[PDB]
Amino acid sequence: LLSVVGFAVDLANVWRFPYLCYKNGGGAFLIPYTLFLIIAGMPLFYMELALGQYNREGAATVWKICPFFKGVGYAVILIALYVGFYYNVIIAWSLYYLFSSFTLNLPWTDCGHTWNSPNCTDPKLYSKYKFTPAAEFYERGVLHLHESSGIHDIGLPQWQLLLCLMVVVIVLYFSLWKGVKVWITATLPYFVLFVLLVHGVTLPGASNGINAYLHIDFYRLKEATVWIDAATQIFFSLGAGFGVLIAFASYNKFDNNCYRDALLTSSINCITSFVSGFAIFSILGYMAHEHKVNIEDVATEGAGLVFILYPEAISTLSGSTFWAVVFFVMLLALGLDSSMGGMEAVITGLADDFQVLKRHRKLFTFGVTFSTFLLALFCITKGGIYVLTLLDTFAAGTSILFAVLMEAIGVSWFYGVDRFSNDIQQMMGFRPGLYWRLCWKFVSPAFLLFVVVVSIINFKPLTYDDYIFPPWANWVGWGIALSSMVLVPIYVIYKFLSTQGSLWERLAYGITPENEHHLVAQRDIRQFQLQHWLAI
Ligand SMILES: *[C@@H]1O[C@H](CO)[C@@H](O)[C@H](O)[C@H]1NC(C)=O
């Protein structure tokens, strides 16, 4: 139970799920989330865990089972880097909020400070939500967003955010430069969410919030963005698609039970997400009651909802300083562990691939943490929330859905879901079952392909709150998405143009596992027969 709750909650469930829910309503986002967690989330979580635990390799080198698909591991490592770029910036925000939380008069309470606009209006004394003292502290006091007109005109990095990001990358380096990889980081998210839930239900005007949460709008389900949001958040919360699961299972015992691991992680994720949305909407209803505004336009739908929503919940608690310090220490440590997991996925994959990097661990981890620092300097600029939004919507998006779709395809169709079931039976001692095989070979790939094509053809232009990104920003975002999606066909063409022989024996050498290339020469290969593909 401790092992599954330690990683069942991460920075995703606590930071990204609130604004993805609020942006898409109440249960209107919890319906696709649960359907994808049961249909595609849990099966592919269990598939990645079993793959890593059996093959004993990272994300990139696990594809010695089907060599044409190593581009998928390269893609997930690139996605992990891209996501760490702004995870470190979220941790910088957590550090700045924790540092600001060490006073009796919390800064996000009144409008009497130096960062406040002349239009800062607090209820204690039909407006907009950017004129509340909490949103004024987030935008004008932390981000300094008021000094940039858009993603074209981003300023220089923010000094305080620069120091916070330096501290983050330094602690990450000193946490990863020897460690091949705890009670508080695993128990405190749930305790904080429990306190949040109970104090939210006791708040005035939060019943309107929980009703707006429990009201499921099906016209939102008839459109396509809620499903893309739910799929991407499923793969963020569970960690499938960043190479973290395969890298972490590479170190698990051979007899370890990935079935029970996946089951507990997925069930705890579903319950945690439901109660997380419940508490988030309790606070949002309280804010709509306090600010005399509608619930649908009471806060931002960007990445900074938590840093506006949770400070306002804290300011209502008794002993606001203690609870602010506790919540932001929790957020700091949680996102810190998440970013450590991502960077360790990157390092483990690229070190299992190239041994010159496995022998040189300190230099490689310095190069990894120092590349994620220079490219996170863009997200701590004055217009860095626009770059962070671009990355958040494009780094892991259609890209991660495509990567996980190709993982499913390469494990189920080309390697064999029957071979995978035999390997799983060899690890644990029991066959997966019919539901798991039908989801691995047919249900999850079909749902993921549908979500990918719908994510491409139902693309809405990128926006911040009321800021329409220029078209070139959308082109740059699609370049960010394609930079990892093209690794799969590029590597297929590279592996085909680097193997001697005729067409069919090149194909055979590229779809046969590396350890039994002996049988390729004697022409006894499974995938060239029909009984391999008709196995359901
Ligand atoms: C913001 O304050 C400025 C002060 O000159 C002025 O534009 C107005 O009072 C406020 N703007 C809006 C849109 O309320």
Which residue has tokens 């501290």? 167
Amino acid of residue 155:
G
- Enter the resolution in angstroms: 2.9
Question: Half-sphere exposure (CA, 13 Å, Cβ side) for 284?
Answer: 28
130 appears as a binding residue in the annotation = no
For ligand 1, atom 7, the nearest C-alpha belongs to 119
Give the rounded distance of the alpha carbon of 144 from its chain centre: 25
Residue ranges per structural domain of the chain: 2-498
Which DSSP symbol is given to 460? P
Burial 482-504 (b: 16+ CB within 10 A, else e): ebbbebbeebbeebeeeeeeeee
For ligand 1, atom 5, the nearest C-alpha belongs to 118
22 appears as a binding residue in the annotation = yes
| Neighbour tally for 135: CB within 10 Å | 27
SS (H, E, C) 5-26: HHHHCCHHHHHHHHHHHHHHCC
| Four-residue CA torsion sign, 405, 411, 413, 414 | positive
DSSP H helical ranges for 38-69: 42-55
Ligand 1 pocket mutation, candidates 116, 117, 119, 466, criterion most atoms within 8 A of CB? 119
217 appears as a binding residue in the annotation = no
337 appears as a binding residue in the annotation = yes
Which residue has tokens 């310095």? 366
Whole-number Å distance, alpha carbon 135 to ligand 1 midpoint, is 16
Whole-number Å distance, alpha carbon 205 to ligand 1 midpoint, is 29
CA gap 126, 144 in Å, rounded: 25
344 appears as a binding residue in the annotation = no
Task: Assess whether the C-beta atom of 105 lies below 6 angstroms from ligand 1.
Answer: no
For ligand 1, atom 8, the nearest C-alpha belongs to 119
Task: Assess whether the C-beta atom of 119 lies below 6 angstroms from ligand 1.
Answer: yes
Measured from the CA of 127, which atom of ligand 1 is nearest? 14
CA gap 14, 338 in Å, rounded: 11
219 appears as a binding residue in the annotation = no
Task: Assess whether the C-beta atom of 118 lies below 6 angstroms from ligand 1.
Answer: yes
502 appears as a binding residue in the annotation = no
CA gap 53, 253 in Å, rounded: 7
CATH code reported for the domain at 2-498: 1.20.1740
What are the distances in angstroms from CA 214 to CA 28, 222, 224?
9, 18, 21
C-alpha angle with apex 8: 337 to 335, nearest 5 degrees? Answer: 25
Whole-number Å distance, alpha carbon 208 to ligand 1 midpoint, is 30
Burial of 267 (0-12, 13-18, 19+ CB in 10 A): middle
CA gap 242, 239 in Å, rounded: 6
Experimental method: cryo-EM
| Per-residue tokens: 382 | 């004055």
Whole-number Å distance, alpha carbon 136 to ligand 1 midpoint, is 14
| Per-residue tokens: 265 | 């992680």
CA gap 389, 143 in Å, rounded: 13
- Where are any strands of DSSP class E within 298-427? none
Contact present, 287 and 309 (Cβ < 8 Å)? yes
Measured from the CA of 118, which atom of ligand 1 is nearest? 2
For ligand 1, atom 1, the nearest C-alpha belongs to 119
Q: Nearest CA to 17 among 326, 332, 391, 280?
A: 280
What are the distances in angstroms from CA 146 to CA 94, 138, 163, 392, 504?
20, 11, 20, 21, 60
Whole-number Å distance, alpha carbon 117 to ligand 1 midpoint, is 9
For ligand 1, atom 9, the nearest C-alpha belongs to 119
Whole-number Å distance, alpha carbon 144 to ligand 1 midpoint, is 18
For ligand 1, atom 11, the nearest C-alpha belongs to 119
Which residue has tokens 């997991």? 341
What value does the CA radius of gyration of the chain take, rounded to a whole number of Å?
Answer: 24
Contact present, 35 and 298 (Cβ < 8 Å)? no
Which DSSP symbol is given to 132? S
CA gap 85, 373 in Å, rounded: 7
Question: Half-sphere exposure (CA, 13 Å, Cβ side) for 115?
Answer: 21
For ligand 1, atom 12, the nearest C-alpha belongs to 119
330-334-340-345 Cα dihedral, nearest 10 degrees? 180
Amino acid of residue 299:
A
Contact present, 372 and 85 (Cβ < 8 Å)? yes
Whole-number Å distance, alpha carbon 424 to ligand 1 midpoint, is 64
> What are the two backbone dihedrals, phi and then psi, of residue 406, each rounded to the nearest 5 degrees?
-75, -35
The CA-to-CA distance between both ends of the chain, in Å, stands at 33
127 appears as a binding residue in the annotation = no
C-alpha angle with apex 311: 307 to 312, nearest 5 degrees? Answer: 120
What are the distances in angstroms from CA 158 to CA 84, 111, 482?
19, 22, 30
What are the distances in angstroms from CA 111 to CA 124, 161, 250?
10, 22, 52
CA gap 460, 226 in Å, rounded: 12
80 appears as a binding residue in the annotation = yes
Whole-number Å distance, alpha carbon 129 to ligand 1 midpoint, is 14
149 appears as a binding residue in the annotation = no
Whole-number Å distance, alpha carbon 120 to ligand 1 midpoint, is 10
Whole-number Å distance, alpha carbon 119 to ligand 1 midpoint, is 6
